[PDB]
């Protein structure tokens, strides 16, 4: 329910990321940029949020994914830690799919869950704050990939992480 028009929040972006000027695309750069030290900025983890956070309702958006390893995306609670090295786990307030070692995974803790979904090109993220779910679909055939069940009780932001050079995420279109 309700396609949303998202832009990456440049006050959150870790200084090693390269954002697109239209605030849709993100990759990892070779060096930290000299960005201003905003309190909301991830100073260590390779993360950026969208500027829009959701308190209720059902929302969906699409993410164009690179073929090469080194990305994760989904949603984060607003209280996700910004300063210091924070584990990438549901307990630390991130719910995401990742591509690592040529395999797709739901980032569950304490063990990640391997998916057998085959090659991904674009992924729909559906957030339902009434039901308490974030779900991922392959856009081709809208095949269900994975749903995290969470009793979300703070604002939820779209989350992107790129931890290797040579891959990318882009909010589509």
UniProtKB/Swiss-Prot annotation:
GO terms for cellular component: cytoplasm; Golgi apparatus; nucleus. GO terms for molecular function: ubiquitin protein ligase activity; zinc ion binding. The keyword Ubl conjugation applies. Residues 1-173 form the B30.2/SPRY domain. Changing residue 161 to A: Complete loss of interaction with GYG1. The keyword Cell division does not apply. GO terms for biological process: antiviral innate immune response; innate immune response; protein ubiquitination. Disulfide bonds: none annotated. It is found in: Nucleus; Cytoplasm; Golgi apparatus. Keywords: Antiviral defense, Coiled coil, Cytoplasm, Golgi apparatus, Metal-binding, Nucleus, Phosphoprotein, Transferase, Ubl conjugation, Ubl conjugation pathway, Zinc, Zinc-finger. Skeletal muscle and placenta, at lower levels in heart, brain and pancreas. Isoform 1 is widely expressed with high level in testis, kidney and heart. Auto-ubiquitinates via 'Lys-63'-linked polyubiquitination. Belongs to the TRIM/RBCC family. Forms homodimers. Interacts with GNIP2. Interacts with GYG1. Interacts with RNF187 (via C-terminus). The B30.2 domain mediates interaction with GYG1. E3 ubiquitin-protein ligase that have both tumor-promoting and tumor-suppressing activities and functions in several biological processes including innate immunity, regulation of ferroptosis as well as cell proliferation and migration. Acts as an antiviral effector against multiple viruses by targeting specific viral proteins for ubiquitination and degradation including norovirus NTPase protein or SARS-CoV-2 NSP5 and NSP8 proteins. This is E3 ubiquitin-protein ligase TRIM7. The chain holds residues 339 to 511 of 511 of the full protein.
